Structure 1
């Protein structure tokens, strides 16, 4: 009768650097949903970010969310 639901709340709106509205479709679909960011560049971001593509939005904890945030602010000190 006591089953932990520490992950079941995921299907909701997320705020980001430009948009405040973001549901869950895919990690690369959300990063394409971000304005000015395309599909292949988004694939580059996730492979550099070590975040697994198989996962979805809402499945991602704080430090790696903000890691994606930092590496979408700066694309140069991380090599490109």
Structure 2
């Protein structure tokens, strides 16, 4: 019965540029859900 901090709040399904990208999948395979983006573009975007 002691306070333990929660490391951030999990925000479920996100709107991003007319796309409802889901908050339960990984970030790279989530960014490829938008129309007109591939896997290389996705992990390049996350790398920079």
TM-score > 0.5 by shorter chain: yes
- Report SS of the residue matched to 2:15: coil
Aligned to 2:6: 5
Which structure 1 residue ranges, 5 or more long, are not aligned?
Answer: 49-80
1 or 2, which has the higher helix percentage?
Answer: 1
Please tell me whether the aligned partners of residues 32 and 42 of structure 1 are also in contact (alpha carbons under 8 angstroms).
yes
Higher RCO structure (Cα 8 Å, ≥6 apart) = 1
TM-score by length of 2: 0.68
Q: Can you give the 5+ residue segments of structure 2 that lack an aligned partner in the other structure?
A: none
4+ runs deviating over 3 angstroms: none
TM-score normalised by length of structure 1: 0.48
Q: CA RMSD in A?
A: 1.8
Higher strand share: 2
Give the 5 Å matches for 1:1-80: 1-7=2-8, 9-10=9-10, 12-48=12-48
